Amino acid sequence: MPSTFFNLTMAFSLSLLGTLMFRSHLMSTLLCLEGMVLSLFIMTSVTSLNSNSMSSMPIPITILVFAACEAAVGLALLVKVSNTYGTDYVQNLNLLQ
Amino acid sequence: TDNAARILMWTELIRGLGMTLSYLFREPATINYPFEKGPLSPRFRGEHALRRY
Amino acid sequence: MWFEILPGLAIMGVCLVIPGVSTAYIHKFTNGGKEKRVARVQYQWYLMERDRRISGVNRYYVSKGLENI
Amino acid sequence: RAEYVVTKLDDLINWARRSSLWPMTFGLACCAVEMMHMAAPRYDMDRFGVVFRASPRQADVMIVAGTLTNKMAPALRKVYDQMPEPRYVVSMGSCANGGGYYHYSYSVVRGCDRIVPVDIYVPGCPPTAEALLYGILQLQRKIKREQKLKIWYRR
Amino acid sequence: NNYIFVLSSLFLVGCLGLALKPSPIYGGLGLIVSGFVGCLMVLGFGGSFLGLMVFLIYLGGMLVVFGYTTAMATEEYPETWGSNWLILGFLVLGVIMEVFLICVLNYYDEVGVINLDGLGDWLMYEVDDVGVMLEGGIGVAAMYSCATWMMVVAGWSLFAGIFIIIEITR
Amino acid sequence: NLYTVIFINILLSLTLILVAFWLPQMNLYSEKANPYECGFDPTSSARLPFSMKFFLVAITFLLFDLEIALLLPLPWAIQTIKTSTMMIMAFILVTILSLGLAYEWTQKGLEWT
Amino acid sequence: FFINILTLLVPILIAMAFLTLVERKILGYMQLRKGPNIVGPYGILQPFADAMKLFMKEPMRPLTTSMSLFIIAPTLSLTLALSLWVPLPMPHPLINLNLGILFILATSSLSVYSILWSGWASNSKYSLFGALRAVAQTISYEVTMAIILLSVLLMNGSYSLQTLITTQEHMWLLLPAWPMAMMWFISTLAETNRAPFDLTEGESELVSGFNVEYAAGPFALFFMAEYTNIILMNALTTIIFLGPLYYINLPELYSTNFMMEALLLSSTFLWIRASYPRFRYDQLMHLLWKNFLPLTLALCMWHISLPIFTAGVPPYM
Amino acid sequence: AGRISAFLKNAWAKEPVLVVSFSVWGLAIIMPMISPYTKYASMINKATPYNYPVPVRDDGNMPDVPSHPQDPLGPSLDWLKNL
Ligand code: SF4
């Protein structure tokens, strides 16, 4: 259990390092954001399973629904960015300076 | 109700299914050509040949 | 005619009636004339674990009725 | 004896290719109708197990039908080169054999022999659907009587 | 026997590749490898509903996330994990950092995190043996009855999500 | 058990890929490995940007999949004791989903742009 | 157990090969052909020769493709298509999952992931068109299909697959749930890409879709996976909706009745393939979100109300 | 009052799927309010044994809580065994 939970904390620290930098695309950053969705589901379900607090099983479906709904909002936000630009890149977005 | 039973049960698609069900129970129109050869004509022009008297 | 498709459909029916009958017969031969118990809940798994510990030869399927008691 | 085992494995590997060979949903001509007439249920492809797939990566034999013009020539060689390595070519009809009409035209490649190898020349303007169904029988016996694993063995 | 630790190291590898950020078409492949890993982790832990539910919701979301990668955010010459050599050197550096982290983590702590014959024994804490409801399905069934505000706020999130997405994409 | 069935399926399909690749003869060249598009080389690169035409109906496919994962515990929520508030909650959220799809149906974004 | 693995995995391959044979024969007799008569006694040795042609032909290694996804998509496609059979009930299953309906749903979407990775990493414009109409096809089918499986398992209270046959011991679920049954048969046609709802394999608007650049070998192994999915969801519709009479003393009689019913359902599947014309990716999405999703939301409404109106609350096991 | 009937029959003839869906939706809304078996579902979900209802201590006080399990006292199930 503490090896699994500390490696999930390492996976969140790695995906923090992933979404806290930008290589070429905003969409790989949004894939890192959905990696945070999956990592928080696995962490919440592992916590509820080993604590056996089955009354808090409404919480990880609420994690998935709210975080994947804001992920879907950002996916169509990238659709509107590529519609209003024609490009997609991180360096394209320097017009607000 | 006849139009609303044509839609939502798709009974004309069931009618097309019955059409194909009527055609699957037929002895088929194929011939087995290396053993059952084709219908032709006496005027069927084919390989060129020189005749003889 | 209509009886032309039915040889290939009949060997299709034989070769697809063979895995369900084969898995029922291999479950009967695995569990010794009995069928394999299904653990939908934890109570059935503890029931099968207690069945193994009552039989004592690390076996679920053999069981101690009133011949031991 | 090992040569008997090699020739029976050669017959077992050529029986599959002579039976379940998969042609091409081609076109181009008058001769496109007679490929559709070999698909038609009087003289039938699918009785032999001869199936019109559309993709060149999935095809096994190319039925070149009719005229092969100068614009159609890279559009025939590109397709044959993207056929995978058992590639057999039927040439339906006299315009794919040697240019039946339009031999002396400005824009017909004079037969399909100028571009790809053709393993069987089926003549006519109609090859009848039974006549190149005979042609698929003769290619079927040709790659029955070919010897691949035998000359793999004696080499 | 070491199923959850082997799967969690594979989750660390998959989230490391997603963190090292390829073309996001390949990132969807790496994240769905991590999704299959997490579904198998919850099904090996005892959540028979939650892993397959995240596999259904994640395969169905990530399908059209993958379609948006290959439509909108694509590139003529993309970067996989083996294309760019700084990404490949960072991949082997993260792999040797992970095994150096476990090689220092079985030695520094002197507690039961990693032991070569004593890991996996502290995984199942307590499930009831004679009890009948121990799977995760009935607890998330209870949000219809006890925790009704969760379903109120999730249905309002999806209703507002439909209206918000029509207003974004208009 | 199921891990061993998944791994023997891996071994069977990997054995089928190995017998598909290594046993047939193969010579490969540049025109053979040229990508197929109708018998000519492609006009642009094949990973050139698609302008997506089902984008808002794609996002409501995603959000409808979140709703059906919300609705997945309901076969065990039918066994609950507070069945009046269970059926009222199921009624109000299927009414929410039908009203959202009715809004999208009236706004006519089901058609592509 | 491995004997059961081999004797369940070999004759399902023989069964889907004979399903391709009776596809060619049943479409032939529909289309007034005779079907592949000349090889074998009546056709039996045709699909063994089709596998022995398509696996002794070579595949491509194209420049434009990505080679790792090129070799890792079809090994997935055969693994997931042969692994949906392991929670299927029969009399007694090879593996009894606790909740197997979600496994069927998720790994059936993962088959479309194998198709979708083929469509992108095949790297043609035709293959990218096939990948995005796979995306639009699953946009059409998936929410509808899971609402159907949810709204029928409001009558059988667990997600288990043996609970379906102990629910359907007395009557079939065709008779209480025929508005579920017609749209489920249509939605599983949309799942398994058959000729009304076959886009993404295409063959009449585009050239091949997901297997444009996929030559023999991996195209054959996709073909293996696709017809394994055809006989799979035929058997799944057969067990879930017209599930036969179940006798605990005689499981083999029920298995013979299930296989006569499954060959009737597979003949209905190929009969639908050779009876209807083909959809469009716009009209497919249009009526599966317009003429299906209000109707299956209302059927979800009515089967939510069905443990309240007639007071049939289903048991757990 | 003919306009609503003409619109209903026109939608019934043209696009009857939304008419059938709204009718089945309103039937599922109103049919628990009509049916008398709504109150039996909570009776079923209460009277199922699902855990152990534990014995209680006694000082000779309550007569309704029985001692033998086959006593006539307590909540019986003649509305479930016979019905
Ligand atoms: S060979 Fe004859 S029939 Fe065929 S295209 Fe030429 S002219 Fe027409």
UniProtKB/Swiss-Prot annotation, chain A:
EC number: 7.1.1.2
InterPro entries: NADH_UbQ_OxRdtase_chain4L/K, NUOK/Mnh_C1-like
Domain of life: Eukaryota
A Gene Ontology molecular function term of the record: NADH dehydrogenase (ubiquinone) activity
Transmembrane regions: 2-22, 26-46, 58-79
Membrane-topology annotation of the record: Multi-pass membrane protein
Subcellular compartments: Mitochondrion inner membrane
Record field: catalytic activity: a ubiquinone + NADH + 5 H(+)(in) = a ubiquinol + NAD(+) + 4 H(+)(out)
Purpose of the protein: Core subunit of the mitochondrial membrane respiratory chain NADH dehydrogenase (Complex I) which catalyzes electron transfer from NADH through the respiratory chain, using ubiquinone as an electron acceptor. Part of the enzyme membrane arm which is embedded in the lipid bilayer and involved in proton translocation.
Recorded family membership: Belongs to the complex I subunit 4L family.
Name of the protein this chain belongs to: NADH-ubiquinone oxidoreductase chain 4L
Organism: Mus musculus (Mouse)
Encoding gene (name): Mtnd4l
Swiss-Prot record, chain B:
Domain of life: Eukaryota
Disulfide bonds: none
Gene Ontology biological process terms in this record: aerobic respiration; mitochondrial electron transport, NADH to ubiquinone; mitochondrial respiratory chain complex I assembly; proton motive force-driven mitochondrial ATP synthesis
UniProtKB keywords: 4Fe-4S, Electron transport, Iron, Iron-sulfur, Membrane, Metal-binding, Mitochondrion, Mitochondrion inner membrane, NAD, Oxidoreductase, Repeat, Respiratory chain, Transit peptide, Translocase, Transport, Ubiquinone
GO CC, one annotated term: mitochondrion
Keyword rRNA processing: no
Major subcellular location class: mitochondrion
Localisation: Mitochondrion inner membrane
GO function term, MF aspect, one: 4 iron, 4 sulfur cluster binding
Similarity section: Belongs to the complex I 23 kDa subunit family.
Subunit text: Complex I is composed of 45 different subunits. This is a component of the iron-sulfur (IP) fragment of the enzyme. Interacts with RAB5IF.
Role description: Core subunit of the mitochondrial membrane respiratory chain NADH dehydrogenase (Complex I) which catalyzes electron transfer from NADH through the respiratory chain, using ubiquinone as an electron acceptor. Essential for the catalytic activity and assembly of complex I.
Protein name: NADH dehydrogenase [ubiquinone] iron-sulfur protein 8, mitochondrial
Organism: Mus musculus
Curated annotation (Swiss-Prot), chain D:
Catalytic class of the enzyme: translocase
Bound cofactor: record note: Binds 1 [4Fe-4S] cluster.
Molecular function via GO: 4 iron, 4 sulfur cluster binding; metal ion binding; monooxygenase activity; NADH dehydrogenase (ubiquinone) activity; quinone binding
Cofactor(s) listed: [4Fe-4S] cluster
Cleavable signal peptide: none
Posttranslational modification: Hydroxylated ar Arg-42 by NDUFAF5 early in the pathway of assembly of complex I, before the formation of the juncture between peripheral and membrane arms.
Keyword annotations of the record: 4Fe-4S, Electron transport, Iron, Iron-sulfur, Membrane, Metal-binding, Mitochondrion, Mitochondrion inner membrane, NAD, Oxidoreductase, Phosphoprotein, Respiratory chain, Transit peptide, Translocase, Transport, Ubiquinone
GO cellular component term, pick one: respiratory chain complex I
EC number(s) recorded for this UniProt protein: 7.1.1.2
Domain of life (superkingdom): Eukaryota
Record text on subunit structure and interactions: Core subunit of respiratory chain NADH dehydrogenase (Complex I) which is composed of 45 different subunits. This is a component of the iron-sulfur (IP) fragment of the enzyme.
Family: Belongs to the complex I 20 kDa subunit family.
Protein name: NADH dehydrogenase [ubiquinone] iron-sulfur protein 7, mitochondrial
Organism, scientific name: Mus musculus
Highest classification ranks of the organism: Eukaryota, Metazoa, Chordata, Craniata, Vertebrata
Gene designation: Ndufs7
Swiss-Prot record, chain H:
Region (Disordered): 58-83
Domain of life: Eukaryota
Keyword DNA-binding belongs to the record: no
GO cellular component: mitochondrial inner membrane; mitochondrion; respiratory chain complex I
Membrane topology: Single-pass membrane protein
Gene Ontology BP term (one): proton motive force-driven mitochondrial ATP synthesis
Keyword vocabulary terms for this entry: Acetylation, Electron transport, Membrane, Mitochondrion, Mitochondrion inner membrane, Respiratory chain, Transmembrane, Transmembrane helix, Transport
Subcellular location: Mitochondrion inner membrane
Bilayer-crossing regions: 18-38
N-acetylalanine modification, residue list: A1
Pfam families reported in the protein's UniProt record: NADHdh_A3
Oligomeric form and interacting partners: Complex I is composed of 45 different subunits.
Family assignment from sequence similarity: Belongs to the complex I NDUFA3 subunit family.
PANTHER family documented for this protein: NADH DEHYDROGENASE [UBIQUINONE] 1 ALPHA SUBCOMPLEX SUBUNIT 3
Role summary: Accessory subunit of the mitochondrial membrane respiratory chain NADH dehydrogenase (Complex I), that is believed not to be involved in catalysis. Complex I functions in the transfer of electrons from NADH to the respiratory chain. The immediate electron acceptor for the enzyme is believed to be ubiquinone.
Protein's name in the database: NADH dehydrogenase [ubiquinone] 1 alpha subcomplex subunit 3
Organism of provenance: Mus musculus
Gene symbol of the encoding locus: Ndufa3
